[PDB]
Swiss-Prot record:
Binding, substrate: Y230
Family: Belongs to the TER reductase family.
The keyword Lipid biosynthesis belongs to this UniProt entry's keyword annotation: yes
Gene3D superfamilies on file: NAD(P)-binding Rossmann-like Domain (3.40.50.720)
Other remarks on this protein: Possesses high activity for the reduction reaction, but no activity for the reverse oxidation reaction.
Regulation: Inhibited by lauroyl-CoA.
Active-site positions on this chain: Y240
Source species: Treponema denticola (strain ATCC 35405 / DSM 14222 / CIP 103919 / JCM 8153 / KCTC 15104)
The gene coding this protein: fabV
GO biological process, one term: fatty acid biosynthetic process
Pathway, per record: Lipid metabolism; fatty acid biosynthesis
Full protein name: Trans-2-enoyl-CoA reductase [NADH]
Function of the molecule: Involved in the fatty acid synthesis (FAS II). Catalyzes the reduction of the carbon-carbon double bond of crotonyl-CoA to yield butyryl-CoA. In vitro it can also use hexenoyl-CoA and dodecenoyl-CoA as substrates.
UniProt site (Plays an important role in discriminating NADH against NADPH): E80
Amino acid sequence: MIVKPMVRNNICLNAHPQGCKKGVEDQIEYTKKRITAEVKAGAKAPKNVLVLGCSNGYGLASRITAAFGYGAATIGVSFEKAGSETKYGTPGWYNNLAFDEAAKREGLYSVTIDGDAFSDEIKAQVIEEAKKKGIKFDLIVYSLASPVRTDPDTGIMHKSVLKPFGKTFTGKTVDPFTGELKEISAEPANDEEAAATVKVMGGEDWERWIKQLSKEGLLEEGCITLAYSYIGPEATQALYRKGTIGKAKEHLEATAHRLNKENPSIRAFVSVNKGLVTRASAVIPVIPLYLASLFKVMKEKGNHEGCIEQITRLYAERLYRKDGTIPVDEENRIRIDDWELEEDVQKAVSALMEKVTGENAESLTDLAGYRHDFLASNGFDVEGINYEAEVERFDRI
C-alpha cells in the first residue's frame, strides 16, 4: 500500500522503510565527506565502540560516525519492534537494518542487539558477544531515550515526566503543520514524579553498564564514555534547569563524576548537545517555537546542525583532536551546544520569538525545517523517495 505519514496525538505512528534507509545512507554519505583523511590526520581514532540507543537521533549518528568515519567496529543496542509482512516496525528497526547492511557492504564488523538496554539480559548478550570476538571497548556512547524504565533489581516500572517544580510553567508554542500559535502549560510535579524521572533519565543505568563491563574486563585503558544531555535556552530553564528534567541531568552529571573517581583508567563525560525535534517536543511549552526560531536563525547564520553534523563535530573536534585534548566547560562537561547558546544566536532567537504571530509564523520561523525533521525521523519527506510508489512489505529494506 501507499505509505503516508499517520500522526496521532503529536506522534507519527508508522514509518517508511525505504525512507528510513535513505535517511541512514544520507548520514553515511555526509560522514564520509566530513571525516576525511585530513580531518583524521594526526589524531587518535575509535576502534571498538558500544552505542546504547543506536537506532535513532544522536545514537544513530554516533554509530555511523564511528563506523563510516573512523572504520570502527560497533555493537549497537536498541529496543525496537520488528516489522513483519503486513504491519509496521519502529523506524529504528529499519534504521538498524539499513546500518548493518551498509556496514556489511563496507566490510565492517557490526552487531545489533535488540532488546531492553535497561535489562541485565541485554547487558549479558553484549558481554557475551564482546567476549566472543575478543573486543575491549574504547568508546561507549550512552544515548538511551525512553519515557519508561524497569528497575533491574526490583522489577518496578518507572515513568518520567517533563514538568517544573513549585509553579505551573506556561509558554507559547506552535503547531508546525497548521502554523497555529498556542498557549500550553506544564503543571508542577510531585516527589514521586521527580524521583521516577531521575530513575529513568538519570545516570543509574549508564553506571550499571560501565560497572558490569569493567568487571568483565571489557574496557580498554582510557576508555571514553559519554551520556548525551541538554541545557537549553533561558526560556525553558523552568524544566531543563530546575524541573524534573533538570534533576535528572544533575544526576547524570554526578554520575559521570563518580565514574571518573572509581575508575582512574576511564574518561567519563556528559555531552551537552544542541536542541532538536524529539518525540516529546510537542507537549513541552516553548520548545517547538524556540526550535523553529532556532533553526531559522542558525540556518541564516550558517551554524545550523542536525544529528550527523553535531556528532561528526563531536568526534573530530572534541573526542579525537590533533592536540589530544578533550575541551570541557568549567563543570567538566563536553559542550557542542556552544553554537546554539552563542549570545548572538540567543539574542536573535529571543527577538524572533517575540515577533511571531499566526500570520507570519511560516515566514518568520523554519516551520518547514521542523516538519522535515519530525517526518524524516520516521522516513517521511526525505529526498529521493517516490512516496507515491507503494510499499510491498514491511519486514525488509
